[model samples]
Target: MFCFQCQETAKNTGCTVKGMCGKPEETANLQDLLIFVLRGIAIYGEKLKELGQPDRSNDDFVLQGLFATITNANWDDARFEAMISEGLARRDKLRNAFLAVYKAKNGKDFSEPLPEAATWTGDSTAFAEKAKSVGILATENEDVRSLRELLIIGLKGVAAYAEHAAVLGFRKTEIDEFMLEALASTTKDLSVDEMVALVMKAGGMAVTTMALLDEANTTTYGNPEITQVNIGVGKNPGILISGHDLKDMAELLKQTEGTGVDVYTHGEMLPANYYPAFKKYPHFVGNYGGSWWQQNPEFESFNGPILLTTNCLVPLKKENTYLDRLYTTGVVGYEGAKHIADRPAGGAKDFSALIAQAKKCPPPVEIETGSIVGGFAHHQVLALADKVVEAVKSGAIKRFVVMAGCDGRQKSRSYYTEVAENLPKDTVILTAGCAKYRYNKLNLGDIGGIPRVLDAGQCNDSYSLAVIALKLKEVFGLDDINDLPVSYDIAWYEQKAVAVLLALLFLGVKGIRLGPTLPAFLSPNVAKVLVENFNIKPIGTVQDDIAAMMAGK
Candidate 1:
């Protein structure tokens, strides 16, 4: 198996033997095969679109299939196997429907040829053998492969965000069509310019999808606001809910209330504490640990069942014994962990199982005390626009650095921490995603009553940072967003961050710095295009980057 879709790919190259995220060769191969099948479904789905018979039946299924393949999301081989079979079924149903429509519309026999992916037929038994010919290496041209993978990876991120909005009963047909169109394009022999354009289109869709999610979340939970969340544990047995799904968080909070079990947010779910809808629940405690990678020790000390509502779940270690206490819902899956099915029609998900388990456990072990402040999403930041504008005009806030993206276990990630700690006191670090974990707990004081680091929420909330920048640009009467007193120094881990980067590029933001290392999926030529076209730079020494960002490089 070969995979290099994440920042931590082996030695900054493809993972040939096993995934760096603990996914085995078998699971990785199955994921590749599942993607291959989805491409077939997209081929037919796209043909239907060309015939004016577009099929919307399986758009969400395609989204789930792509999302399941994201790094650290699902490692269960059986899950991929099932999805592959379902994809084939959907492809055939669409094919038959298209055929029927063609005959009815033209009253003649169809004679057009289809791509191999559109016509292929296989079962789970043949998936392994078939996947061998369909992995990333199948595309012989290095640059084409790079461009294709970039779009595919970005689509994975879009799917993740789209699914979040979908769970809240928000659906955008345009976004769904774009996803299908993008996936289908990957199967065709498109030119360099076409692929790049498709990637930019994905970036646009990324922005729209994130905006829809923001609207869905704010409309449902109310806009996030300034709030203090306890890092300390309470004396009741608790359930720690991780990942980025807010619907799950709300359901769990409701089900566990008055049941002698408490709910605590972890990892990407940390920002749930800032939403007004959740704060009303007295049993809803605060965040438990740091980023996704620290769950080993953190989950163990929680002393209660842990529910992973989405990705960034670390595989269990041999000596670790938290597997029995683990629960997965939505697209998240593991071999031994108990699975929580989706919510029934017109009803909420049953999390009583988790509540029951939490009743027998002890309270979480306190790892820290005091509280961390957040809830500076787009709405919150816009509410403070007047004060922020005054600070900029008065020179109290000299610059705003967009220090947003993901975090990982690599020690080099400490660069983010050091950069946060060493930036000039007048500079404000505008952050989103878990990267905020680096300096959020730091002692960096406020800048004229504005927190030194303003967190905009999870990785998808990077959209909030962009919104803040565009608003700032408009307020300053700047014709170009790049003219705003802001610099992007981002750190990425998985496909979601990649999607965020593409969104920034689509917005024409330039001279951005990205690290801990550019994605290994990028070929030299593709990387060159990004650098020459967008002035994309790798993160340099802390002192030099600080100097450059300060000088507005």
Candidate 2:
């Protein structure tokens, strides 16, 4: 059960027994097996592309399969087992398809020995036993393992965002092609230089996939406007939707419309409150809680059903009693939670079951009152570009600190809060993801008429932050993006953050300070590569980092 795919791995190394996120050894092992099988699918999936018989029949499955393995996304061993079995069948189908095309093309029998991932066959019992040997430790070279896992973990984040775009009817076949090629590369023996190139390619793809999701979200929900969402509770019972899927948010809002049930956003779903389409629902209330880690207490007090639409779900504690009121859709799953099936073609997901549960429950207890401002996604910020540029040119805003990424249960996360609180008043904080929970509600005050903290959207919308940065660079007439008055002090918790980091690197942005501890997956030498080439560093004390960021270090 060796795993180090998240920031909260045990002791900043690996989780060998139980995950710090509460994933059991069995569930962890099955996820490893699922990845192994996905690699097999990609192995053949890439071969089809090579033979000029490229097929996308299995791309969505690959995306969802990888997404389900993301940190805290799925805890059900049964689901992993089923997915592994399904992947094996899909791999074999791809294998047969590739072989037939190859023989037909060359007028000779295709006779190449495939890798183990391509040839491996297993049942549920076999999957359990096979995963033990196929985990991270299976790679013997430390640096190679680091690079491979880095690409794979970043791909998990890619799959997550790409799946979101796919649900909204957006597709990027080239993104799937790159993913399959990258996944297949991990199975072969490659030089360090070769592996690093693949990792960089993943960065560009991360940017592209995130852009695709941005389009999907804005096109479907309309551009997010500057919105002041209520933090207060309403009298009617609510269903709190968490995680980063706006598609599910859309369907749930539609189904619960006119019902007595009120819908409130939670965790990453907080950004859903900013979308213009969702704002029209009279019953759609405000956000109900803090970040994803606070769910145990928040869900209990809400006294209504909760829907987990995607990742960042902390497993329930034995003393917590919200399981019965929890519903999971998309790739999310827990042992006892009722699972909502995917929507049929040209239709919506059925949330009738979850809606019924919300009807019988009481309204959420107020955790906080008043409103918080957000909806500074790329379009909104660009709409105010003239204002922003004026402030920058006139010296009203000295710098922009990108304090984006995830939040967690660790006390070290308080570093973000301290930095946010202590940063110069003239500097504006650009944030996305749940990390904003640390300071979004803080009375940090505004710079001129603009808010000090501008939240773009969810972690995926870190794309918005990048777009905003590039625009600032162009507006300021700077040849290099790093020459702009912006500093990245990002706090990451999982694979999605890794994808965001890589995207920044690919854009040639440097001098990033990443923390809550650097990813445990980075071997010393690979870490050195990042440090030397990209100027990536771990976060230091708040005072020192603030000083360094202000000076453009």
Candidate 3:
């Protein structure tokens, strides 16, 4: 059980017994087997494509399978086994095709023996060793190993975003091929430098994947508009929907339409409050909590049913008040929670079960009071471009700091708050993802009543931050996005955050400061490439980082 995929990895190294995130040894081993089997499928899928075969079924399945193994997504052994079986079956099919073709071409046994996918069935120690051999983070060379793992983790995030777009039948073959190719390479003898290049390439693909999802989401649900969401609790018994799946949120709202159960967004789902489609629901109340890592306490206090649509799930405690009422859909899962299956194409989800359970529970505990303003996406922010320009020209706004990405349980993460609180009065903080949890509630006086902190949306809506920067570039008539009066200081946890970081790099954004801790999955050499090529730096104290960011050196 060697896992080091998150910032909270034990001792800044791999977690060999149990994951800091609470993943058990068995679960960790299964996840590794799952990744290995998916990589084999991806390798075969790429080979088939090289042979001019356009079979996308296995490729799509492998992408989703890899995403399901990401942190907090799935912990169910049954589901993991089912996916492994499916991947092995696909691998066998491809192996047979390769064999037949080689026989026809040379009349000899030209097939390489396929790696055993059934290795997961061994005893715990044996399984652990096998898992260690195949897990991306287990590479021996620290530098190359870290970069390879980062690339895999980054692509896992890209695949998750891609899955959301795929749910709506939006497909991009180039992204699919790149994902498969990269997954296969992780199992190959690629060097440290070669893997670092692949990592950057994954970052480029992440940007494309996010763009595709942005189109899919906006086309399905209109672009988000500026709105002030109530952080206050309502009186009615409610269902809390967290994580980032808009489709699931829509269904629960629909199913609970007249059930007297209010719906509230939690964690990343907080952005649902800003979307025009979600805002129309009178019973859709508001957000109830902070970031994803705080959910153990937040969900317990909520008292009613909670639905997790995706990642960032904390392991539940026995005293958890909402355990019986907890529901999971999409890639999110908890061992004892109820899972809502995906509906047929364009079909609506039946969250009547959650609605029914909510009717049997008490109203949520009121936690806080205040309104957090967000929905300053690219278009929304651009609508005020002239005003923003005037603010800059008049010297009222001197710098814009992009503080986006995930927030975790690390105590060092307090640096973000210190930085935000200490920024010059003329500087504004533009944030997205759970990182906004750090300063979103702070009483930084507004510029003309527009709060000092502008939240663009969820982690993936870091896409919105990128969009905002590109638009700023256009308005300022700058040939390079780096010329904008903006600096990026991001904090990341898990693979989805990796995808967001990559997207920023893909867009040619530079000199970003990333911390509370650098990813254990990135080798020093790979980190060096990011530092040399993009000027990426780890975050220091608020004053020092701010001084450096403002120094513009």
Give the number of the best model, judged by lDDT.
Answer: 2
Q: Which order, best to worst by lDDT?
A: 2, 1, 3
Q: Tell me how many residue pairs clash in candidate 3.
A: 2
Q: Compared with the true structure, what per-residue lDDT tens digits does model 3 show for residues 200-293?
A: 7998999889989888877887888899899999889899998888888878888888879999999989988988988999999899989888
Clashes in model 2: which pairs?
none
lDDT of each: 0.91, 0.91, 0.82
Q: How accurate is candidate 2 locally (lDDT)?
A: 0.91
Clashes of each: 0, 0, 2
Off-target runs (Cα >4 Å) in candidate 1 are none
On a 0 to 100 scale, what is the lDDT of residue 450 in model 1? 97
Per-residue lDDT over 1-553 for candidate 2, one digit per residue giving the tens place of the 0 to 100 score: 8999999999999999999999888999999888889889998888888888898888889999999999999998898888988899998899889889988999997787777888989678787788999889999999989999999999999989999999999988889898799889989999999999999999999999999999999999998889999999999988999998998988888899888999999989989988999999999989988989988999999999999999888888789999998898899999999999998879999999888888899889987898889999999999999999999989999999999998888999899999999999999999999889988999988888899999998998899999998998888889999999999999999899899989999999999999879999999999999999999989999999999999999
TM-score of each: 0.99, 0.99, 0.95
Which run of 10 residues does model 1 get worst, by summed lDDT? 109-118
RMSD of each: 1.0, 0.9, 2.3
